Amino acid sequence: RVAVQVFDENLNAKDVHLTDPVPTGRQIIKAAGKHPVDDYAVLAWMPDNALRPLHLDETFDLRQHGVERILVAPSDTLYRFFIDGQDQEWPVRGITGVVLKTLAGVDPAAFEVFLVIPGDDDIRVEDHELFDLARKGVEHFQTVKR
């Protein structure tokens, strides 16, 4: 019985055990106890903090060392954004600054995340400020040392 960490839009971990060593996205969503399956987007959180979308029939090999990270969220569209030069797709419409800094792999307290707008003033997203990713265009976030 392998184990994984199912997250949410707030990056709250939730250990879930699966008998299948190599389950599909549908199996992971079933294990998360979220229904219907078609309404939820699942992304594999790679060790380098990269969110790669996983499809309902795409298998994720859990038969490795360590507990894998999976982010399952109720979503109908994935919004693209850049955090510290890393491309990501967030399933949900709004993202908190603490989540952005966690994705950047930096200390939430020691760093401040800024939406970088070249030529204009950058917008500082607070730790618990739900910045809306629905804004037109790809969002470039950078974590400046506080």
Return residues touching a copy of itself (CB under 8 A): 19-22, 24, 26-27, 30, 36-39, 41, 50, 52-53, 55-59, 75-80, 82, 84-87, 89, 112, 114, 116, 118-122, 124, 133-134, 136-138, 140, 142, 144
Cis-peptide into 36, omega within 30 deg: yes
Give yes or no for residue 89 binding Ca ion (CB under 5 A).
no
Distance CA 124, CA 74 (A): 27
The phi, psi pair for 34, rounded to 5°, reads -120, 125
DSSP label at 132?
A: E
Token pair in block for residue 79: 């919004």
Was 20 annotated as part of a binding site? yes
d(CA 131, CA 99): 11
With CB cut-offs between 5 and 8 Å by kind, which of a copy of itself, Ca ion, none does residue 140 bind?
Answer: a copy of itself
Asked if residues 22 and 63 have their Cβ atoms less than 8 Å apart, the reply is yes
22 among annotated binding-site residues: yes
Is residue 20 at the binding interface for Ca ion, with CB under 5 A as the rule?
Answer: yes
Nearer to Ca ion, 42 or 133 (CB): 133
| Binds Ca ion by CB under 5 A, chosen from 72, 73, 103, 133 | 133
Radius of gyration (C-alpha) of the chain in whole angstroms: 16
Annotated binding site for Ca(2+): 20, 22, 120, 122, 133, 135, 137, 139
